[PDB]
Amino acid sequence: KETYSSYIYKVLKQTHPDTGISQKSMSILNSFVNDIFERIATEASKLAAYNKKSSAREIQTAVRLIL
Amino acid sequence: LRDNIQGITKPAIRRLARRGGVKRISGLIYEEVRAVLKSFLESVIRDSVTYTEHAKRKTVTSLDVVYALKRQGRTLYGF
Amino acid sequence: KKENRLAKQKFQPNETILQFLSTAWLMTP
Amino acid sequence: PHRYKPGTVALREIRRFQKSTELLIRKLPFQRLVREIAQDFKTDLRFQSSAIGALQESVEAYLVSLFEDTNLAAIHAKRVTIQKKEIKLARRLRGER
DNA sequence: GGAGTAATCCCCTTGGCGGTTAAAACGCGGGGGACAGCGCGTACGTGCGTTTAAGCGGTGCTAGAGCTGTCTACGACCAATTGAGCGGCCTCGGCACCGGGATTCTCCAGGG
DNA sequence: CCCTGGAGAATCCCGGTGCCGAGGCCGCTCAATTGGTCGTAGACAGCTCTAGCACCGCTTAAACGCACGTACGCGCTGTCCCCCGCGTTTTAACCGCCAAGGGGATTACTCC
């Protein structure tokens, strides 16, 4: 139903106008993008519970440490 | 209605070694790697059956293989 | 290619060396 | 009888087998081993369709990584080919248990 | 006049075979892989005559630390409207491994 | 013996030329707006304070040579082993083909 594919091809048109890709790459995109989402959500969950300050800096720290 | 293994090839195990960077062979190349396969798989299924017997519940969709093998020590992508 | 495409036991005694091939024949022809 | 030195024709075997997406595992009996593993303790799996390919490719990853680690430990010793002791070195250090 | 009995749909399994190729193995030749003992020396072996530092303990507060009033700075309900890309399809550009053509990869027995 | 004339094999530059192929395009629809409501995380002022660092003042604990000195690192060298090379053959999963009952659902027929 819902497809990120149209937005992905919009970004492609921002980069390359007339290039074609495969469906297996799309499925791997789905898997890896979603597991990145899960990991980034997991990393920045209880950081606000490390000290009594419970935002943007949580996910910023997540991307700072995973990368 | 059950089937069991017969020895895991001279040829296909040889290609397994071929992509493992092996040209000739010793007497300890074909059989033992399959033994490591069996030991690792028996350990991971031991953990899985412990998980599914402690609470006595079934499993979920094909997303289990990537998570279970990642905890095991070698997971996969592809879809 | 025939050998590749293609792919009860009996009882039989033997006799040799010292032998009396015996026959009680009324040799009357 | 064009019989050449083994190892160089084994080298061309390596070149052929290490070039494309060819499935080097002639391995539906690998699937039967997986079935024996799965139905060893439980039953009524009712799994997906292509999950056999994913689990088998994970098996390939584990076994082949073991193969390269074993060959590295073998050239570490004075024996180029795969030896069981090299595999013990490759698996025990991984934390097998 | 909606449910009780039961006649209907039906499709899905419980299971056994056509058709089937790969799956493991044989199998012979040999020659490269199998694994180590020695050469000897270099590769370490080592234990007491000869010192800086390490882990400190003699004042006074001394960079960061936990600290209780009373809040400044914000992030999530509902209700009528509406636009993003989704609900479904398949359009025009460019596909997709062995052939036209064969020099590469590898060894071997005579030129030399 | 080196060097090599000659022998074996095998898939890289671009298609087979008919279709894969990704998410534009028809617009609509369902959780986003803004119409008002609402009390909670983050925090500013606040006060000395934990254990001991600046001096002094340390006692030996590692840290450093010597005088030889005494064995094993890597490959020669050894059999030895030994298992692929790749053709060839036989164990060996998957997916339709069969003809039936169970039975969940579902209403024909009906009934209290």
Curated annotation (Swiss-Prot), chain A:
Annotated protein name in UniProt: Histone H2B.1
UniProt keyword terms in alphabetical order: Acetylation, Chromosome, DNA-binding, Isopeptide bond, Methylation, Nucleosome core, Nucleus, Phosphoprotein, Ubl conjugation
Self-association and partners: The nucleosome is a histone octamer containing two molecules each of H2A, H2B, H3 and H4 assembled in one H3-H4 heterotetramer and two H2A-H2B heterodimers. The octamer wraps approximately 147 bp of DNA.
Keyword Acetylation: yes
Name of the encoding gene: HTB1
Residue(s) carrying N6,N6-dimethyllysine: K1
Residue positions where N6-succinyllysine is found in the record: K10
Originating organism: Saccharomyces cerevisiae (strain ATCC 204508 / S288c)
Shown residues within the full chain: 38 to 106 of 131
Subcellular location: Nucleus; Chromosome
Function per UniProt: Core component of nucleosome. Nucleosomes wrap and compact DNA into chromatin, limiting DNA accessibility to the cellular machineries which require DNA as a template. Histones thereby play a central role in transcription regulation, DNA repair, DNA replication and chromosomal stability. DNA accessibility is regulated via a complex set of post-translational modifications of histones, also called histone code, and nucleosome remodeling.
Record-stated family: Belongs to the histone H2B family.
A GO term for molecular function: structural constituent of chromatin
GO biological process, alphabetically ordered: chromatin organization; negative regulation of transcription by RNA polymerase II; postreplication repair; regulation of DNA-templated transcription
From Swiss-Prot, chain B:
Post-translational note: Glutarylation at Lys-70 (H4K91glu) destabilizes nucleosomes by promoting dissociation of the H2A-H2B dimers from nucleosomes.
Sites of N6-acetyllysine modification: K58
Effect of K70R: Mimics unmodified residue; does not show increased sensitivity to DNA damaging agents
Major site of localization recorded for this protein: nucleus
Residues recorded as bearing Phosphoserine in the entry: S39, S43
Gene that produces this protein: HHF1
Mutagenesis / variant outcome for changing K70E: Mimics glutarylation; delays in cell proliferation; increased sensitivity to DNA damaging agents
Note: Present with 524000 molecules/cell in log phase SD medium.
Subunit structure: The nucleosome is a histone octamer containing two molecules each of H2A, H2B, H3 and H4 assembled in one H3-H4 heterotetramer and two H2A-H2B heterodimers. The octamer wraps approximately 147 bp of DNA. Histone H4 is a component of the UAF (upstream activation factor) complex which consists of UAF30, RRN5, RRN9, RRN10, and histones H3 and H4.
Summary of the function given for this chain in its UniProt record: Core component of nucleosome. Nucleosomes wrap and compact DNA into chromatin, limiting DNA accessibility to the cellular machineries which require DNA as a template. Histones thereby play a central role in transcription regulation, DNA repair, DNA replication and chromosomal stability. DNA accessibility is regulated via a complex set of post-translational modifications of histones, also called histone code, and nucleosome remodeling.
Entry-annotated residues carrying Omega-N-methylarginine: R34
Protein name: Histone H4
Assigned protein family: Belongs to the histone H4 family.
N6-glutaryllysine found at: K70
Part of the full-length chain shown: 23 to 101 of 103
Any GO CC annotation of this UniProt entry: nucleosome
Swiss-Prot record, chain C:
Location(s) in or outside the cell: Nucleus
Top-rank taxon: Eukaryota
Transmembrane segments: none
Record's subunit section: Belongs to the SWR1 complex at least composed of ACT1, ARP4, RVB1, RVB2, ARP6, YAF9, VPS71, VPS72, SWC3, SWC4, SWC5, SWR1 and HTZ1. Interacts with HTZ1.
Additional remarks: Present with 358 molecules/cell in log phase SD medium.
Family stated for the protein in its record: Belongs to the VPS72/YL1 family.
Function: Participates in the catalytic exchange of histone H2A for the H2A variant HTZ1, an euchromatin-specific factor, leading to chromatin remodeling and changes in transcription of targeted genes. Indirectly involved in vacuolar protein sorting.
Protein's name according to its UniProt entry: Vacuolar protein sorting-associated protein 72
Species in which this protein is naturally found: Saccharomyces cerevisiae (strain ATCC 204508 / S288c) (Baker's yeast)
Higher taxonomy: Eukaryota, Fungi, Dikarya, Ascomycota, Saccharomycotina
Residues represented out of the complete protein: 266 to 299 of 795
From Swiss-Prot, chain D:
Modified residues (N6-acetyllysine): K19, K27
Modified residues (N6-succinyllysine): K42
Entry's Gene Ontology molecular function annotations: cupric reductase (NADH) activity; DNA binding; protein heterodimerization activity; structural constituent of chromatin
Modified residues (N6-malonyllysine): K19
Residues modified as N6,N6,N6-trimethyllysine: K42
Post-translational modification: Phosphorylated by IPL1 to form H3S10ph in a cell cycle-dependent manner during mitosis and meiosis. H3S10ph is also formed by SNF1, promotes subsequent H3K14ac formation by GCN5, and is required for transcriptional activation through TBP recruitment to the promoters. Dephosphorylation is performed by GLC7. Mono-, di- and trimethylated by the COMPASS complex to form H3K4me1/2/3. H3K4me activates gene expression by regulating transcription elongation and plays a role in telomere length maintenance. H3K4me enrichment correlates with transcription levels, and occurs in a 5' to 3' gradient with H3K4me3 enrichment at the 5'-end of genes, shifting to H3K4me2 and then H3K4me1. Methylated by SET2 to form H3K36me. H3K36me represses gene expression. Methylated by DOT1 to form H3K79me. H3K79me is required for association of SIR proteins with telomeric regions and for telomeric silencing.
Similarity section: Belongs to the histone H3 family.
Designated name of the protein: Histone H3
Species of origin: Saccharomyces cerevisiae (strain ATCC 204508 / S288c)
